[PDB]
Structure formats: structure tokens, C-alpha cells
């Protein structure tokens, strides 16, 4: 029932920015966080940032801080992430992942329950 359909392979040159989108269904989109993870070849899973679709707060790992920005719109129910200062090492597969459940009373951003995964986009540089 859950599905996160994503954009296509956004091949781009170094120096520019790459913007990926993942459209959500099944889950009530405002209820669950969206985390982002990256499979850089050679390296393992590499985590970029979370975003609260209900509030809009975002954070990034120190490798990505200041380099990644995110946005969405809850009516359509689609999520976006954009990466600045693209380079060759960013050639990787981006994956849009959701969970845990958002609450006003206990923080559950960092709770790494990547419940459902989108099919991917092959970002290639270049």
C-alpha cells in the first residue's frame, strides 16, 4: 500500500545542483518523516538529512551541512530534496525513505526506522 515514486536519472555536470523528488502514497504524508540516504559506490549507505513534512525543520550530517536543502507540499503529497555543489563523487543512487511517526510530544526524527523505500534515481556525474 505504501509507495514512494521518484524522479528519473538526473545526470548533471559538476558545480550545478541536482534536485530529486519522491511522491508519497498510502501513508498520510503529513504524519511520517522523510529521511534521505545515498549509496555511493564503494562506500556503504550514506545518510543526508531528514525533513518534517508537518513542520519543515531540517538537518544534515556534517558532511552535507549547508550543502543540502529540502522542500515539499503536503496537498499534492510530494517531497523534494536538492543538493548544491555537485561533484563526481556524488555519482550515486538516491533513496527516499519514511519513518518513524511524527509526534508533538517526543522527538522521533533520528529514530532510524526507514520503513519503506522508493525505487531510486541514478544520479550520475558526469
Amino acid at each position: 500500500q505504501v509507495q514512494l515514486v521518484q524522479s528519473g536519472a538526473e545526470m548533471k555536470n559538476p558545480g550545478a545542483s541536482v534536485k530529486v523528488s519522491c511522491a508519497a502514497s498510502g501513508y498520510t504524508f503529513t504524519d511520517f518523516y522523510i529521511h534521505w540516504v545515498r549509496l555511493a559506490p564503494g562506500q556503504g549507505l550514506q545518510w543526508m538529512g531528514w525533513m518534517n513534512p508537518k513542520t519543515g525543520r531540517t538537518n544534515n550530517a556534517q558532511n552535507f551541512q549547508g550543502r543540502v536543502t529540502m522542500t515539499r507540499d503536503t496537498s499534492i503529497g510530494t517531497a523534494y530534496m536538492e543538493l548544491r555543489s555537485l561533484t563526481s563523487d556524488d555519482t550515486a543512487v538516491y533513496y527516499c525513505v519514511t519513518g518513524g511517526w511524527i509526534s508533538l510530544y517526543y522527538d522521533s526524527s533520528y529514530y532510524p526506522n526507514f520503513d519503506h523505500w522508493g525505487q531510486g534515481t541514478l544520479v550520475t556525474v558526469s
Binding site: W50, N52, T55, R57, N59, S103, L104, Y105, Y106, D107, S108, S109, Y110
Partner: protein, 104 residues
């Protein structure tokens, strides 16, 4: 007794308990202006918390003395709140009801 110098306005926190029954106390229950104290037989547990993860900033103000203030919220923004077990609060409130009935 080891009296608690507790600061609390609408509810009494970590206080002492009555030995056998819930108690009500007031200088004159006829007056609408006078406060009425209620003292419980068993406690009703309350838990409060800040889910916001503050970081303590250290600002310097003049000769050496520091002024501390909230820095960034390292984490997601969340609501500070309190909790009470609903059924136990209902039971305690209805029992204070029976004790209010003895005077009304």
C-alpha cells in the same frame, strides 16, 4: 518532617500524604474567596519534559562573568508538555468529589 520547599501553583508536588483518607481543608468553606486545600490518600503520578534539545550557550558579559542562554535546538522542534494517567486522575477527582460532598 522533611518539609519540601516546593514551588508549585495549581497542584502540590512531591508532598506528604494522609494516612487513611483523602482530606479537605479550608479556613471557612462558606467564603468563595478563601482557598480550599485538598490532600490525597494516594499520589497521582505526573511526568513533564522538554523534548526540545537545547544547547547551553556561554555569552560573556563584562568582567569575566558569563550569561548563559539557549543556543540552537539541535534536533526537531517539539512541544514541552506534562502527562497524567487519565483513569487515576479520574478516580482521584471523583474521590475528592465524595469528600466535597461531605461538606456539600
Amino acid at each position: 518532617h522533611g518539609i519540601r520547599p516546593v514551588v508549585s501553583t495549581q497542584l502540590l508536588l512531591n508532598g506528604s500524604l494522609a494516612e487513611k483518607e483523602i482530606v479537605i481543608r479550608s479556613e471557612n468553606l462558606t467564603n468563595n474567596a478563601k482557598i480550599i486545600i485538598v490532600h490525597l490518600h494516594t499520589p497521582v503520578e505526573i511526568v513533564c519534559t522538554r523534548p526540545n534539545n537545547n544547547t547551553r550557550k556561554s555569552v560573556r558579559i563584562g568582567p569575566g562573568q558569563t550569561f548563559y542562554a539557549t543556543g540552537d535546538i539541535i534536533g526537531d522542534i517539539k512541544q514541552a508538555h506534562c502527562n497524567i494517567s487519565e483513569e487515576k486522575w479520574n478516580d482521584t477527582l471523583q474521590k475528592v468529589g465524595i469528600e466535597l460532598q461531605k461538606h456539600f
